[PDB]
Structures are given as structure tokens and as C-alpha cells.
Amino acid sequence: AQYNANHPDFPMQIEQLERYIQRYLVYAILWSLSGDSRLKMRAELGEYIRRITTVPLPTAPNIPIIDYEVSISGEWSPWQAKVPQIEVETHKVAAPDVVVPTLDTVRHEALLYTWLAEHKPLVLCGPPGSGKTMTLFSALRALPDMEVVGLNFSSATTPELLLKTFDHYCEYRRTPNGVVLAPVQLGKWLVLFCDEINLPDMDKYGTQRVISFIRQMVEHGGFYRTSDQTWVKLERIQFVGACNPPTDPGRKPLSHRFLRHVPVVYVDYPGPASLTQIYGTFNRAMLRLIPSLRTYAEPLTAAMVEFYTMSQERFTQDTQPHYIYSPREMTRWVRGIFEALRPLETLPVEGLIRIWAHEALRLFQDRLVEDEERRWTDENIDTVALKHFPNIDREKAMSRPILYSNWLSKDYIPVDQEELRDYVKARLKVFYEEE
Amino acid sequence: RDPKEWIPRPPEKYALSGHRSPVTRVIFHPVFSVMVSASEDATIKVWDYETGDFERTLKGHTDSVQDISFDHSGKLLASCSADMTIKLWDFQGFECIRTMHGHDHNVSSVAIMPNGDHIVSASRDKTIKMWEVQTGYCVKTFTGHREWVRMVRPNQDGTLIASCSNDQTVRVWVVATKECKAELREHEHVVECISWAPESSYSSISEATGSETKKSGKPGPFLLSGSRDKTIKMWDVSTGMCLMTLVGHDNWVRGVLFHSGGKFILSCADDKTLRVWDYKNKRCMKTLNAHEHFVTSLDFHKTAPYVVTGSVDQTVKVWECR
Amino acid sequence: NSVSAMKLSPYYKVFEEDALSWEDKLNRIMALFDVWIDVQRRWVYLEGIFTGSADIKHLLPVETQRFQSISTEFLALMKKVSKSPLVMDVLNIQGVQRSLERLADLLGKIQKALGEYLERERSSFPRFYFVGDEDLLEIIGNSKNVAKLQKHFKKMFAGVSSIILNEDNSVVLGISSREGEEVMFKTPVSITE
Amino acid sequence: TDGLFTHVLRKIIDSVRGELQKRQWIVFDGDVDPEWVENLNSVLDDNKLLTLPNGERLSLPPNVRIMFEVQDLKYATLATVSRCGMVWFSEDVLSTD
Amino acid sequence: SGFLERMNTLLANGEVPGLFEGDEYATLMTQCKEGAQKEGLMLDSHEE
Ligand SMILES: Nc1ncnc2c1ncn2[C@@H]1O[C@H](COP(=O)(O)OP(=O)(O)O)[C@@H](O)[C@H]1O
DSSP states (O other), X not given: OHHHHHOSSSOOOHHHHHHHHHHHHHHHHHHHHSTTSOHHHHHHHHHHHXXXXXXXXXXXXXXXXXXXXXXXXXXXXXXXXXXXXXXOOGGGTTOTTOOOOOHHHHHHHHHHHHHHHTTOOEEEEOSTTSSHHHHHHHHHTTOTTEEEEXXXXXXXXXXXXXXXXXXXXXXXXXXXTEEEEEXXXXXOEEEEEETTTTOSOOOTTSOOHHHHHHHHHHHSSEEEETTTTEEEEEOSEEEEEEEOOTTSTTOOOOOHHHHTTSOEEEOOOOOHHHHHHHHHHHHHHHTTSSGGGGGGHHHHHHHHHHHHHHHHHHSOTTTOTTOOOOHHHHHHHHHHHHHHHTTOSOOXXXXXXXXXXXXXXXXXXXXXOSHHHHHHHHHHHHHHHHHHSOSSOHHHHOOSSOOEESSSSSSOEEOOHHHHHHHHHHHHHHHHHHO | OOXXXXXXXXXXXXXXXXXXXXXXXXXXXXXXXXEEEEETTSEEEEEETTTTEEEEEEEOOSSOEEEEEEOSSSOEEEEEETTSOEEEEETTTTEEEEEEOOOSSOEEXXXXXXXXXXXXXXXXXXXXXXXXXXXXXXXXXXXXXXXOEEEEEEOSSSSEEEEEETTSOEEEEETTTOOEEEEEOOOSSOEEEEEEOOGGGHHHHHHHHTOOOOSSSOOOOEEEEEETTSEEEEEETTTTEEEEEEEOOSSOEEEXXXXXXXXXXXXXXXXXXXXXXXXXXXXXXXXXXXXXXXXXXXXXXXXXXXEEEEETTSOEEEEEBO | OHHHHHHHSGGGTTTHHHHHHHHXXXXXXXXXXXXXXXXXXXXXXXXXXXXXXXXXXXXXXXXXXXXXXXHXXXXXXXXXXXXXXXXXXXXXXXXXXXXXXXXXXXXXXXXXXXXXXXXXXXXXSGGGGGSOHHHHHHHHHTSSOGGGGTTSSTTTSSSOOEEEEOTTSOEEXXXXXXXXXXXXXXXXXXXXX | OOOHHHHHHHHHHHOTTSGGGSOEEEEXXXXXOHHHHXXXXXXXXXXXXXXXXXXXXXXXXXXXXXXXXXXXXXXXXXXXXXXXXXXXXXXXXXXXX | OHHHHHHHHHHHXXXXXXXXXXXXXXXXXXXXXXXXXXXXXXXXXXXX
């Protein structure tokens, strides 16, 4: 219908409509029956459909169908055509708003826009830090008539949180058909983003009260106001959920009665190639601050990705609950290096390596419990930077007391341990008299 | 030695060391060629800066002396200390003629008004008080600061007093009617020191900041505020706007003041350096490795070419300007 | 008055609903426009102050930016009015009454912040000392429209009730009194120069 | 800040809503003493001006009448009495019938 | 556990939706008007 609106002189013809509908039906079958599974299972479903279907399908020998969208013209077009190698502004390096386009990113944004436009509740499932909130917000940027409200669920979450959100962002107005709950603003669809939907505790009889409340609000379009036992009908209110896989510790599988109204999309961790693309783009935007360091963007990104991968495999939730590593750590790595490089007019390669090592220590070593783990982190930081950055002064960039501070200077520069100790002694002398 | 262009030079003239505790503040005698330095050992030692010889110690304070000031004639010295008292000293006979109580906590600043008949002091009880010199009575109490007031300074004619506090703001008060003329809140940390602009710098400030000539002819009093965010800001009291921010210090700014000719800004900080600022171009000309520890205060002689800085290393240094 | 006369009539019972509805419409129209006229006048003589004076930006910066914000909002509202200048349409504008009350409050707050500026402006023309702050603001702001300044000349001069102007209202040709007696200037004063 | 009488007179003078075209009567119903009525000495004289301490002078429009409704003048001075046209309402004016 | 619920919401969002209710919300809106004026911003709607 939108295409026909864009072409008043030449509406869609029956043959083009038939082609487009066939291709979109296959695309929707793939993204509905395999949107909540891994890449391998999406490939398996695509192969099975290719074996059974009669519709025209892409002729690529190895690229699975899930990488092809359906153009309005009625032909398969690859998703890679919508993924350009962009150049991020140096002042927007690893900013929260910045999303580096990727195949998975654009596919998920298209799917979410398809689901969000229908005001259909949806749930994004995946490991923490995989990019569920990022993808949701990027897809919501394409829908100006939606205001998203963030809710964070915990094991102690009850429908009272949702009721407080409704009291803040909505109003109960009396209509002849009954009480209607609608957002205070007009023409905008409120989106309730619930970040930990499957954390709320199941009682001894296997139910989550807030999940039942949301299921009632979604299926029946409203809830009961317990103050006067009046049925309240929702208007212009939408629900979007996010959660870790139900097999994770502390997570409970959602009810099948709740899942039927809610399609689930699985957002897995970006692969090493996707990580390389995203954070190489971020480093290239970064290293334009110091032109002499521009040639080191690729080895720096390779070292970052390698150490992140090794730390992710080495430390898991089996050992400690807080041993969770995600692309969020890579984003903080990028932000820290950028903030350390911003005030510097010039810097040798060894200084960049020292900043990289300091940020790696501050991100991957501070949370470790045992001393052996910290020793492993130190040794492997040294080995990674030696492997990806040969022919550099090993001692000048890896003096083990790697300390950085802006207490002895206006900028964030390395600080000697003895000078820092003397300064802290004087500051403590002042601190005793003041506080 | 251009009579309004000298700046201090690296080779020190003298390094006077008789204090047993960090030197809090150093001031110049307006008339005599003598110098006064207050320290944390509850002593007020008096030095001569022409020949660098100790003269006499002014004792009587129980705890650390935090500030000292001279009246216009140089015949009275007002000192405040950590023992919640303000003492007035007859600088001819070097006896304490009056002790003033009334502050509820540490008194961290003191200033004699330009007329010489009143004493204004700031303390840790978040109040500023005015004391008659003749009777020693508390006559006014400027309340409104939310935290420890660190400094109080009257302007040239004594109609305005500025104050800085741990509440990260600078307040300009009206002496006659107690009202708060302005509240200068742009520092991101505690404001340590303040200083007023001499009339000899009004034209320089106006043409450096690009401020157009007002129809009155008075550009409006200008103020400075060194703070712990390592920056110095120049304010226009009349409008309340920050004319410029001076960046370049590596630590908390402890003292700031103008060159007597009103062409440069002299500041000291805890980065162990004394810096000369060319606020014409909003940049720092000269950096002096003044002391081997934190530099707490500085003073610039009105006529003679001398700069003095006290420090936490218990040393008072006199700098020849060339 | 017609609605009230219909109310006192005996046949009003059948036409109670529509008469009450139009009474409400008229009352809201009057309530809106009474605030509207004062808001318009205040903006008219405030924009002149804030644009024709070059030093007001430097002497009064905070109130200056405040007035540009208020004036931008006022011009947005005026553009909305000009789009659909039907009186019901502007009456039915979402939150027109509350916006007008906010504009009136903001303009009053700005006007009360101009005391020092008007007191300093009084020194240029000494006869402004016998003119109140409201009337002085009207005089200085509305200096362009000299047709509305004719009522302020009796407060500044002994017998000059009004001035005589040409067709263009750009050259002052003389002065007049209350009784119509006129004095014709030998060399007329040009406002444009 | 304008008072009640000053506000009324200024509103009439400004005539934003056509006040100058009506018959505006200001009636002072109450007691008369020199404290407040002597401020009207210029208003009730040929000056026809309300001079305020701030230097503002408000001319009396020709359609405005200042009226006093009083029961006795045992405290008003001669300055007030000589400035006004007297109308005497004896109690025999309003008979019990 | 309500302490931790309020901490969870505050840490994640920077605001607690049900903390200010009734007269507290009106007082907060007045104080936010004052603060936004002190920061050189004109904000009128309670949703801004
Ligand atoms: N394509 C991409 N472009 C930019 N950043 C990305 C991309 N993919 C992942 N990230 C990073 O991964 C992190 C995802 O975190 P988030 O979306 O908050 O995860 P969750 O929704 O599970 O909490 C973000 O900090 C983001 O910087």
C-alpha cells in the first residue's frame, strides 16, 4: 500500500505483487520459524525450505537465504547492500547513540520495525551485552511516533512497577465504554521496555505474577484496577521485553501462554569478524586524533579482539557470577583509549600500547577474585601486545606499575608510583583537617 | 625593569625558613620594606625582603594562623586562626591589642576594609562577619553560603565583598545592605582563592575580552576565582558572566592576583609552580618551579619589583622581577 | 445581552442547551481575548526595547535571552494564528488560554526587570522623570509608531498636548495644545535623520 | 505599586477597553479625614492631577467625577470643603412613608 | 528487598517512577523550574 501511495501513476501490478508476496512469505517463514535460534539453525531451515519450496530463491551457492531481504520490486537483494563501511566522527567514538551497521544489526532492525509497526509485543533474547537494547533503540529511531519507557525487572518485581509507570506516563480517563488508560501525550505509542522479564520469581506453583499481568494486558487489552475493581482498557500502549536465555542462572522459562502473543528474536554475540568491523571502525575514527598513530588501527583492533575473546573463554559464570564479558567491555575499552588520547597532541606507539594495556587491566582484571586469574591477565596482555605489536620497546610500554591519573597533571597521563604516593600523603594531610 | 611589566624570574633572591609548620599566607607591608608570613605553627613571623633577614615573631594565637592582612596605613595587622579567634596587632609595638571571638568554627580568612574601620572575616560556620576595629563588636553577619567559606575580599572602595566557599560558588555581597549582589557558580570544584581587579586593569580586561565600552565609562568590577578544578576564571560582577577561563595549572589553584600594572595575572597552585598569565591572549607566559612542595600563597608588591610565595615546605621565597 | 434577554424570555426552556453552549463560547472568547490584548501590547512595546537598544544585550544578558525565548514562542503562536485566523480556530487551539497566561506572566516578569534600564534611560531626556515606568516603556518601545505617543506629551510639557506630523509621520511639523491651538515650527524636526 | 484609587484612575485614563467613552464615577463611601483626603487636593482643584511620590502625575479625564458620600464632615478641613460642590441630604429628604 | 528494587531502578534509569507522588511531585516540579531557570533553560511542561 505504501508503494502504491509512492507511485500514484503506476500502482503495483498483479505479477509484481505475486512475486513480492511469494518472496516475502518465504522471508517471513524464515524469520518467524527461526528468528529465535542460532545462525546454524537458521541456515538449516533455509536449506530445508530451498529443498521443499517452488518459489524463486537466490542463486548464491553458499550464502543462505537469511542474508537476502525482499525488495519492493519483487526480487531478492542481499542485506550486505545496506551495510556500508561508514566513517564515524571522532567526537562520536563509541558513543551510546552510535551504531556501526552490520549484517545482523540491519536484519534485526528490519525485523523489529516489522514487528514494532504492528504494535505487536516482542521479546529480544540473548546473552548480556549482545546488543538487544541497542538494536531496539535503533529500530525505534525509525518510528518517530513511539516513546519508549525503560523498566528494569528483578527477582522482586511485581505488577506494581508497571502500575507506577502507568501512573507517571499515562492517565485513567472515563469513557462511555469504560475506563481507558492512554499516554498523557497524544498521537504517540508508549513502549514499555522491560529489560529482565524472566528474572521475576516463580512461586512454588510455577508462575510469575508480573508475567501473568503482562499476558492479561496483551491478550485481553487491559487489566483490572484493584482499587475499585474496574476493568481498565489499554490504549496506545505497547510492550517490548528483553532477557537472557532461560538456561542462564537466575532466569526462569516464560509461560507458553505468554509466548504465543510474543515473537522472540535471538540476538547472539557479534562474531570475531563483526567485532573486528565495528571496533576497527571505532579505532579508525579514534586514531585520527594522532595522525602518526593512524597506521596502527588494524593491529590495535586485532589485539583488542584477541584479548577479549581469550578473556571471555577463560573466565565464565561457572567460576564467578560476575565473570560476564560482552561487547560492552570492548565499548568501554574504546571509550577509555579515546578519552586518554583526546588531550594529547602527539604520542608514540609505546604510549598507545601502554594506554591499551591500562584499559585492559581496568576492564578485565579488576573484577577477578583469585590471584592466579590476575597473573594470567597480566601475562596474556603482555603476550597479546607483543604478538600484534612487534618491534616496540617492551619495557617502556609494559612497566608493571601501569598507573594513569590526572591528579598530578591537567590531563590523563601515566603517573609514577612514588610521586603519586607523596601527593596522596599530602592530600591525606589536608583530608584529615577537612573531612 | 619596565615599571608595569616586570614578572618574577627563576633565580630566587632569598629562601627564608624559620617556620616549623607549613606557611599559610604571605603579605607585603604597604609602607615599610618589611614582610609578614603566617604559618600553621600559630606564629606570625616578620621578615625584611631587601636583605632577607628574620626580624620578630608575633605569637599569641593558640592554633594555626590561616590569614593575615594590613590596613591601608600599615599600622594594624589583623590575623585569624584555627582557634576561632581574630587578633588585631599594633604593628608599631607588635602587641595584640584586641582578640575577637564569635565565629563557631575555624576562621579561614580575614580582611580589613579599605576605610580601615571594619574587619571582615570568613569561617567554617558558613558565615561572614564584620567587626568594628575600635570596639571589636560584631556588627554584621553575611549568611547564605551553604558550606565552609574559604576567603573574603573587599573591593577597592569597600562597597562590595566577594567570598568563595566549599559549595563551589563565589558570592558578591553588598557591604551596606547585606544583599547578595551576584552568585558566580561555574567552577566544577571547591573555589580556593579570589582576587579583585585593580582599576589599572579595567581597560586591559575590556580590550582583551572584547567588551564594548559601556555608556557609563565604568566597565564594572572584575573578579578572579582560583579553584580546585585547576582553572582560573575572570568574572564581570556587574553582569555575573565569566569573561574567560584560564587553563594550564596541573593541580588545585591556591592563590591568584593581578600584576600591579594590570597587565598580567600571577597565580600559584599545588603543582609546585608559580605561573604568570597573559590574559590578553588567555595563555600562560612563564612557569616558575617555585617550591619543592605545595605553594599555598603569593603576594606581589605594589611598587617594588618583588614577588613572595609561601609553601607547605615551611619556606618563604622572595623573587626578583626583571 | 441578547443571550440574557433570551434567558428571561418564557420560551427559553426548549432552547436552554444551545443558549448555554453559546454563553460558554462567548465567555471563553472574552476571557481569552482580554488576556490576549494585554499580551500583544506588552510584546509590542517590549520587542522595541530589546531590539532598538544595542546596550541592553550587555547590561541585561539573562533577561535578554529570556526575552528572545519568549518572543520566539510568541511568534510561533502568532504564526499558528495566521495559519487559521478564524476566531473559533484560535479559540480551539490546544492550550491557548494557558499559553496566553504563561506569556502574560513571563512578559510581566521581564517588564519588572527593566527598572534599572528605564531609570538610566531617563537621564538622556530629562522630561522622562515625570513619566511612569509603564508609560516610559510604551514611549521608548513604540517610538516607531508615533501615532500612539500623542497621549504622553501632556505629562512631559506644560501645554503641548500633541504634536503635528506630516503624512509620512516622519517629520515633526509642530505642536498642539488641548484647545486646538497650534504652533508651527519654523524648521521642522525630521525623525528619520 | 498602584493603590486602589490610583489603579482605578490609571485604568480609566489608559482606556484600553474604551473607559474614556463612558461616564466613570468614583464614589468614596466612608469617613473623611485629612490623612487620605488631602492627597486629593490637587485632584479636586483646578489642577485636576493626582501627583504620586514617584513623580508621576495623572490628569483627571473630563468624563471622571470624584464623589464623596459622607454622613458628617466634623474632621474634614477647610481645604477639602472648599474644593468640592456640597449637596446636603437632610433626614427629612427620605420620609418614613 | 524494596530498598534493592529502588536501587535497581535508580541505577539503571537515573529516576524512580513512583518516588515522587502527590504533593512531592508538585514540589519537585517547582524546584525543577527553579533549577532549569538557574541553568539558563526555559522548561514548562512537567514531561520536560
Ligand atoms: N554494530 C555495533 N555498533 C556499535 N556498537 C555495538 C555494535 N554491536 C554491539 N555494540 C556494543 O555492544 C553493546 C551492547 O550493549 P546493550 O545493547 O546494552 O546489551 P543489552 O541490551 O544486552 O544490555 C553496546 O555497548 C555497543 O557499544
